[PDB]
């Protein structure tokens, strides 16, 4: 089976780890323990095909930003995650996407914009349309709101990246 190198990116506290662990282990991480570097692997059936996924879960805050260049080069697909309850995390994604494009030099890179923590509707400070508009602005980049807690659109983030990869 073909292997897919997926990278989960985004600012601190958005739920990159919670989403990843929910997808791989099917459990919800309630505590917030900042990631330094973590990789997971999961055998998954996408479109009736066996796929081996290698997911790189990244640190929301890197002392040396240049470290990101290293995993973006190897990464095939990228998930840009922000929290709908934190505006700054949504605004931080612009620089991240430009860094991804700067590393590959190609304006075409399979990715998905993810507005996480959608179960916290009362604390929403980033609109759904607002996120959909950013995605549209990013050359019709895929978009979805998810919840690592309520298990909403968790699998979809990764399944979609695989679809984009096999072009």
């Amino acid at each position: 089976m073909r292997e897919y190198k997926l990278v989960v990116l985004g600012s601190g506290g958005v739920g990159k780890s919670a989403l990843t662990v929910q997808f791989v282990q099917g459990i919800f991480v309630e505590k917030y323990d900042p990631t330094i570097e973590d990789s997971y692997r999961k055998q998954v059936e996408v479109d009736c095909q066996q796929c081996m996924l290698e997911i790189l879960d990244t640190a929301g805050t890197e002392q040396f930003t240049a470290m990101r260049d290293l995993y973006m080069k190897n990464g095939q697909g990228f998930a840009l995650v922000y929290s709908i309850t934190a505006q700054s995390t949504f605004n931080d994604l612009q620089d991240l996407r430009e860094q991804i494009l700067r590393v590959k030099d190609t304006e075409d890179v399979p990715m998905i914009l993810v507005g996480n923590k959608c179960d916290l509707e009362d604390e929403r400070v980033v609109g759904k349309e607002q996120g959909q508009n950013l995605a549209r602005q990013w050359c019709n980049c895929a978009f979805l709101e998810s919840s690592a807690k309520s298990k909403i659109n968790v699998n979809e983030i990764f399944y979609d990246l695989v679809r984009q990869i096999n072009r």
Binding site: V21, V24, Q25, I27, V29, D33, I36, E37, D38, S39, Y40, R41, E54
Partner: protein, 77 residues
């Protein structure tokens, strides 16, 4: 930087923070749990770079602070 990089089964890896007082089992508990791995069913080794990747087995109760900067590997028994 008080960290340790650890290579895990199924070609996975994790870098964990080490706080004085923690044993090896303590620093790796969460990383193993979220991957469905159990320490009692695994052996942990210290990679010996001065001897071309040779592995040296460690006790799970080893003082973690003494391993800062070391690269470890966890294999199943």
């Amino acid at each position: 930087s008080n960290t340790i990089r650890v290579f895990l089964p199924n070609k996975q890896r994790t870098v964990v923070n080490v706080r004085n007082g923690m044993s090896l089992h303590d620093c790796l508990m969460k990383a193993l749990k979220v991957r469905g791995l159990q320490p009692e069913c695994c052996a942990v080794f210290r990679l010996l770079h001065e001897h071309k990747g040779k592995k040296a087995r460690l006790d799970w109760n080893t003082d973690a602070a003494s391993l800062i900067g070391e690269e470890l590997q966890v294999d199943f028994l």
